[PDB]
Design a protein around this ligand. Structure first.
Ligand SMILES: Cc1cc2nc3c(=O)[nH]c(=O)nc-3n(C[C@H](O)[C@H](O)[C@H](O)COP(=O)(O)O)c2cc1C
Lengths: 353, 94, 141, 847
């Protein structure tokens, strides 16, 4: 009862309930759709009018869905079947992927230890920062060495340069976490009097706020089932109908140039295939608009720090706050009338030529 | 096999192992590996005056079980009757 | 130091209308030293350094000709490390000049300096242990 | 959807009828309870009165239709076994149950490449119909609407694996006790869920029909009396025991004097009146302690009495004995956690999975008719709900570990109540953690209380060998623990009375020297035990036997053991001291109930005797100190000695790591085997302690001095033998070090008589040792010991299961198994006649 929880906060279930995918997937999408709409309505545009100004769109993980659906959008009357398509996909992703691999009690001993070691509260997706993709894959290959097929962990997201995300069963991800715990170094080690080459790896690692192992072999079973379900309802995405490029999460390609089903792709693109985020953000643009979840903790800023010096300028569309750095921009720029609403990030090559 | 028969046999096997242990060498490395890896002991308790066989099993863990332990998320605990009374008898401080 | 750079950035906000020449030296320089790499710090601080127009970024240490120095001017150097082009505003030459006709460096001393085979940034760390290209580190009083 | 719940009308002859309807049934077809009331207008004040006759029967009939899938027959003997139904555990019945009670343990959730396990809680789903039937017979006439659940527990029979998704389960309920009390009737039922012939777990439920009963003719009680231990010390003691007609042993001639008896009793009683018993049976085996501390049946307790008033047998044993309880408290309770729980919004979910369609929990009009606070939550829910907490937090979510759980339903709970339940670690029982819990509600009333037995983590005991013995070792424990005292004292006595010394003394104050005196008649008894010390030596068929104590003879007045340091470090005493300290310590642990059942064990050289003694009671405390003591005398004698009693041999402790990071185990083996063959001397690797770090070699002192120097060379030379083995041939590097050997071997042969081994880069001399034991050197001394052992380790004390799979020897490094396979490996490592025949004709299978 989404409407109920909204009206009487008193009745809203635990974060634990709200976060598990079957209800969290669809809701997140509604949040994104909802943001699209405040931007569209407040600009004086139709859904499609907004969409026309776009060189293209793309989502990260489950965000791919709304990007596809957003580009199929034309007029307000028509906007709603587009909404239906999006959230009825997310709903099935959520319901079926949960069924495939549902969270089970963490041995309190593990939770205890993982906590007094400043790591997260064990979940199906670990995020490792400041390690080569190669470096990370190395440690996981080691960890996986000792485990059975059904307990193995893989790279789910290559969000960026030295930023990755491994995923699998929480307990085996905790195992990787231990093998890592010895290989690192206390953050305030002060290796300033040690010669550079000779110094020790400092790096960050934490569990992410998610109930399920996205982009892992744990979910492959729900793949065929979800699609079989997607067909049993109105949902499908014809390349004819998408009006602007929707960059494939793995390829970096367009989803329109596709022999088979575009629906079936983005399902397998969220459930089984990795997200090579930088390669999927191949495009060139002046401005990137972030409609996805979580203010400055969200996808926009991540992609921004990937691009920094290249003249791309990210704007967080869902949060009216203030950046002390003007590193990126918040909700305001999208609507400002002054020349103050047209900011661009430097391209060092040009600026300092 | 008949119970009485099993005894009789198992008996002489036991006495054989003990008699000849005298000459054959002590395969402790292989032994530790049996209970450390095949059995995956989490509490190995040494019953002796001082912690000699313990630090033995401890080195063995660092030397070989470094990775195994990590992945399989098994917390091992190595206790000597000599020095770790509290932990064996389950009687702690506050 | 990376912290040291961050300090200069603060002296910079201090008087935004004042020219500050941030001479980023490395660990591979002459005389006084540093345990620091010549690329890492700059590769890491560059973006922040560049949001202050009063900072004139100057790369120094390990340079001797227009040729090896050029890529740091193009901004092409930072490319080896999968980073956007990262161009510099000038260069300082400390060691390269010690032989010049007009430094007071003694005859036999200029002769000594030349005949030192250099060493790539690849292997400067070895100054801490062996003579490396005819150059060792040694600690002051 | 709306539906009829109650129907009120008249019937023939002025009888009000309240049709009380339950819609949630077994087949969807509504069931009904006919409540009948006499209307009578002649009593203006109380017109309506209830038809009481057959009232219980009508209520029973309706409960039957809801619980029992059988024909309504209330004609069981309450004494007859109730067979259940076979029951296959579907994957989904599990999903439903776990989710109904809220048990999110991964052991029950379908995961790839693992079979689904069923919660011990699930036992109630299986046995419910078999069990509940037990309170139904006419001879146990209750008002099922006033029925009350007191308790319910599950006990896993040892060795039985947990319920699985595959399993087919046969259930049997018997009804152990049915007694009329002041306040009401109590029925104690026992379920036994079996699988594939074998019994898997026991389920215990006790129910209560409140009310006033005179049913005495249909009341009976069986109880399992605790084990009584009795220490027959005196002669009148034995007399008093023989005085009782129920004391009945097999051979009346049995020497009770100085033994310890145990009485494992069951007393079966039948009531005939309020306080007076109708009959009292009391039977059980009488057992006697062996030296191994095993217990063997000696006879019977056989009591029988009509018109009794009390149990005489138990009263006797109470006053004249002690009561062995297997539960042993900790010193202080250790808190585990305090956890927040909730009861379900509706009860239908639990009712559906469990088969408890009792309307009390689901239909408000039934609840209200019974005068309950509302639609009470299934007590059985809270059992499973709380249990889940214990499972998670006390067993670290290892379903396997909880092997016992029990639950007392203190008070009722309504749906949507919050329940802080707290859990502490209270004590031990047989290696399992005893855990107590208590659950209070929002008004701080206690609602639940029970206990659980939880397996300890996988335990392995390793018993220490010689080398670390300290003066006073484990003497503190002698002062505090009773178990300890018994072990030491039994031994110390045996030593005093047969060899004339106190092992306690030697340990307590390390004596420089010690003389035995062969005094009077007892002095002379002692010295013969010294004079019979033989060391046999089978050499090419010939048996070269010598006296161990050369000098003790018919004219000796005393012997004297000597040691410049202190006799506690002379192996003949060292070994008993160690074995004793350990065996004592372990028996204290055993007494505190701290020893896991399935624990695996191993000992290091000497400690292997302590290990076998401690875990498998293969020998008496005295047999141990004996064997071990001779094992030491034996070692002292198997090597030729000087005037000053010097040795031609010794041991070196090596560390392949220190020679070279390259120098492997195969490298130390290789090097030692060459210096062995080359110099034609004796070096062999004796201790394999820590891979690539700690090894020990023994043998000819000269060969030890070569290896120690050969090694020193290979280090300063930086010789990677793993690399030279690739680049050169076998014969090539062979000769290569054969040369290195020969330059060092010259040097030590030219050294004085008993060469003094000195330190190395990776070699340390083991100061003390003089016998090359754990080499082949002692093969000749095998068959005299092999008889000594056989004379002290009797067939009857080797219980197979105590060793099988748990005991890791030293000869073999593989867990004891009595298999053709195993037997062969032993021959291979040893070559023994007794074995070879056995391997050769293994098909001695049939008696
Ligand atoms: C002989 C010699 C004397 C130096 N004296 C100073 C000084 O008084 N103050 C200062 O900030 N840097 C001093 N430096 C550091 C240089 O100015 C410059 O940072 C460094 O030499 C550049 O490294 P490079 O010689 O490899 O190009 C000296 C360097 C050398 C080789």
């Amino acid at each position: 009862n989404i409407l109920e929880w909204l009206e009487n906060p008193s009745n809203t279930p635990d974060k634990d309930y709200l976060l598990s995918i079957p209800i969290s997937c669809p809701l997140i999408g509604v949040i994104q759709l909802a943001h699209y709409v405040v931007t569209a309505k407040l600009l004086g545009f139709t859904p499609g009018e907004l969409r026309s100004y776009l060189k293209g769109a793309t989502g990260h993980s489950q965000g791919l869905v709304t990007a596809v659906a957003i580009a199929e959008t034309d007029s307000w009357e028509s906007f709603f079947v587009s909404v239906r398509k999006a959230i009825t996909v997310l709903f099935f992703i959520g319901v079926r992927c949960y069924e495939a691999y549902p969270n089970t009690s963490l041995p309190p001993s593990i939770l205890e230890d993982s906590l007094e070691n400043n790591e997260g509260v064990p979940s199906p997706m670990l995020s490792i920062s400041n390690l080569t993709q190669e470096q990370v894959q190395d440690y996981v290959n080691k960890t996986n060495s000792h485990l059975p097929a059904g307990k193995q962990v893989e790279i789910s997201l290559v969000n960026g340069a030295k930023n990755l995300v491994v995923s699998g069963p929480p307990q085996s991800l905790y195992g990787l976490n231990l093998t890592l715990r010895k290989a690192k170094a206390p953050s305030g080690l002060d290796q300033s009097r040690i010669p550079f080459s000779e110094r020790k790896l400092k790096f960050s690692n934490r569990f992410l706020p998610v109930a399920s192992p996205f982009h892992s072999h744990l979910l492959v079973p729900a793949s065929d089932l979800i699609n079989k379900d997607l067909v049993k309802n109105n949902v499908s995405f014809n390349a004819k109908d998408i009006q602007i490029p929707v960059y494939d999460t793995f390829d970096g390609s367009d989803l329109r140039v596709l022999s088979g089903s575009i629906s079936e792709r983005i399902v397998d693109c969220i459930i089984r295939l990795p997200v090579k985020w930088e390669t999927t953000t191949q495009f060139k643009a002046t401005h990137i608009l972030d409609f996805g979840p979580g203010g400055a903790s969200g996808l926009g800023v991540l992609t921004h720090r990937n691009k920094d010096g290249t003249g791309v300028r990210v704007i967080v569309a869902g949060t009216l706050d203030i950046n002390p750095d003007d590193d990126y921009g918040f909700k305001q720029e999208i609507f400002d009338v002054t020349s103050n609403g047209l900011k661009k990030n430097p391209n060092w090559l040009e600026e300092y030529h | 096999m008949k119970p009485e028969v099993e005894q009789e046999l198992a008996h002489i096997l036991l006495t054989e192992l003990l008699a000849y242990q005298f000459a054959s060498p002590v395969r402790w490395i292989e032994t530790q590996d049996v209970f450390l890896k095949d059995f995956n002991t989490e509490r190995v308790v040494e019953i002796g005056p001082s912690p000699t066989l313990a630090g033995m099993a401890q080195r063995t863990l660092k030397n070989k079980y470094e990775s195994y332990d990590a992945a399989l998320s098994l917390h091992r605990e190595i206790l000597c009757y000599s020095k770790d009374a509290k932990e064996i008898y389950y009687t702690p401080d506050p | 130091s990376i912290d040291a750079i961050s300090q200069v950035i603060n002296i910079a906000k201090a008087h935004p209308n004042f020219p500050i020449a941030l001479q980023w030296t490395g660990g591979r320089g002459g005389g006084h030293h540093s345990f620091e790499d010549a690329h890492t710090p700059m590769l890491q601080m560059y973006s922040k350094i560049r949001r202050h127009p009063n900072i004139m970024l100057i790369f120094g240490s390990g340079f001797g000709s227009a040729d090896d120095t050029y890529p740091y001017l193009t901004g092409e150097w930072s490319t080896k490390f999968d980073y956007p082009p990262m161009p510099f505003d000038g260069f300082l030459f400390g060691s390269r000049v010690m032989i010049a006709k007009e430094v007071k460096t003694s005859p036999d001393a200029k002769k000594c300096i030349a005949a030192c085979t250099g060493v790539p940034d690849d292997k400067w760390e070895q100054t801490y242990k062996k003579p490396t290209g005819g150059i060792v580190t040694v600690r002051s009083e | 959807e709306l539906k009829p719940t109650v129907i009120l009308k008249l019937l023939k002859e002025n009888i009000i009828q309240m049709e009380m309807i339950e819609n949630r049934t077994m087949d969807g077809k509504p069931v009904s309870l006919p409540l009948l009331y006499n209307f009578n207008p002649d009593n203006g004040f109380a017109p309506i009165s209830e038809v009481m006759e057959d009232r219980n029967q009508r209520i029973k009939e309706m409960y039957w239709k809801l619980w029992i899938d059988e024909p309504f027959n209330l004609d069981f003997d309450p004494r007859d076994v109730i067979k259940g139904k076979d029951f296959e555990i579907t994957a989904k019945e599990v999903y439903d149950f776990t989710h109904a009670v809220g048990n999110n343990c991964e052991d029950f959730v379908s995961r790839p490449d693992r079979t689904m396990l069923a919660p011990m809680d699930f036992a109630i789903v299986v046995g419910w119909r078999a069990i509940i039937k037990a309170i139904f017979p006419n001879t146990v006439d209750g008002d099922l609407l006033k029925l009350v659940h007191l308790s319910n527990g599950y006990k896993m029979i040892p060795g039985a694996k947990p319920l699985q998704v595959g399993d087919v389960v046969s259930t049997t309920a018997v009804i152990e006790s049915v007694v009329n009390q002041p306040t009401g009737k109590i029925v104690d039922v026992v379920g036994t869920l079996s699988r594939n012939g074998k019994p898997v777990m026991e389920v215990t439920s006790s129910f209560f029909y409140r009310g006033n009963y005179t049913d005495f003719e249909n009341t009976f009680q069986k109880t399992v009396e605790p084990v009584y231990q009795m220490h027959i010390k005196t002669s009148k003691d034995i007399a008093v025991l023989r005085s009782k007609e129920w004391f009945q042993l097999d051979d009346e001639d049995f020497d009770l004097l100085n033994k310890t008896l145990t009485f494992e009793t069951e007393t079966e009683v039948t009531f005939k009146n309020a306080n007076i018993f109708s009959s009292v049976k009391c039977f059980g085996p009488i057992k006697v302690e062996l030296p191994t501390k095993e217990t063997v049946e000696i006879g019977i307790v056989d009591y029988e009495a009509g018109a009794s008033h009390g149990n005489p047998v138990v009263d006797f044993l109470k006053r004249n004995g002690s009561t062995l309880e297997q539960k042993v408290n900790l010193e202080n309770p250790i808190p585990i956690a305090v956890l927040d729980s909730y009861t379900p919004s509706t009860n239908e979910p639990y009712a559906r999975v469990s088969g408890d369609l009792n309307p009390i929990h689901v239909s408000r009009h039934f609840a209200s008719y019974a005068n309950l606070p509302g639609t009470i939550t299934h007590g059985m829910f809270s059992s499973a709900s709380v249990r889940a907490l214990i499972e998670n937090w006390a067993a670290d979510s290892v379903s396997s570990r909880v092997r016992g759980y029990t639950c007392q339903f203190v008070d009722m709970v309504l749906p949507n109540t919050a329940l802080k339940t707290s859990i502490q670690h209270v004590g031990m029982i047989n290696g399992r953690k005893l855990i107590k819990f208590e659950t209070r509600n929002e008004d701080d009333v206690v609602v639940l209380t029970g206990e659980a037995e939880i397996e300890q983590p996988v335990t392995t005991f390793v018993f220490t060998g010689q080398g670390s013995q300290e003066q006073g070792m484990g003497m503190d424990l002698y002062k505090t623990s009773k178990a300890a005292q018994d072990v030491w004292n039994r031994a110390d006595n045996h030593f005093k009375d047969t060899y004339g010394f106190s092992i306690l003394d030697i340990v307590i104050n390390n004596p420089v020297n010690l003389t035995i005196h062969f005094g009077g008649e007892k002095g002379k008894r002692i010295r013969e035990n010294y004079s019979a010390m033989i060391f046999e030596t089978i050499v090419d068929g010939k048996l070269k036997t010598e006296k161990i104590f050369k000098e003790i003879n018919e004219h000796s007045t005393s012997y004297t053991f000597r040691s410049e340091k202190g006799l506690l470090s002379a192996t003949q005493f060292t070994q008993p001291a160690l074995t004793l300290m350990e065996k004592a310590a372990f028996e204290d642990l055993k007494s505190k109930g701290l020893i896991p059942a399935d624990a695996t064990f191993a000992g290091h050289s000497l400690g292997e005797y302590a290990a076998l003694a401690s875990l498998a009671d293969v020998m008496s405390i005295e047999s141990l100190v004996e064997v071990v003591f001779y094992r030491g005398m034996t070692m002292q004698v198997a090597v030729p000695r000087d005037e000053l009693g010097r040795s031609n041999y010794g041991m070196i402790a090596i560390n392949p790591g220190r020679v070279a990071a390259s120098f492997s185990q195969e490298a130390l083996q290789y090097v030692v085997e060459r210096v062995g063959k080359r110099t034609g001397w004796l070096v062999e690797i004796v201790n394999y302690n820590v891979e690539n770090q700690q090894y020990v070699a023994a043998g000819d002192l000269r060969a030890l001095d070569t290896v120690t120097n050969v090694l020193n060379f290979i280090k300063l030379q930086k010789i990677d033998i793993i690399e030279l083995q690739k680049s050169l041939s076998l014969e090539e590097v062979e000769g290569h070090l054969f040369e290195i050997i020969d330059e060092a071997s010259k040097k030590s042969a030219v050294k004085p008589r008993p060469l003094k081994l000195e330190r190395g880069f990776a070699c340390i001399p083991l100061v003390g040792i003089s016998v090359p034991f754990h080499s082949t050197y002692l093969m000749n001394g095998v068959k005299p010991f092999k008889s000594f052992l056989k004379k002290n380790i009797i067939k009857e004390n080797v219980k197979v299961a105590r060793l099988a799979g748990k005991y890791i020897p030293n000869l073999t490094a593989k867990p004891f198994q009595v298999t053709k396979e195993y037997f062969q490996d032993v021959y291979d490592l040893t070559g023994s006649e007794p074995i070879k025949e056995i391997i050769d004709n293994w098909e001695k299978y049939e008696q």
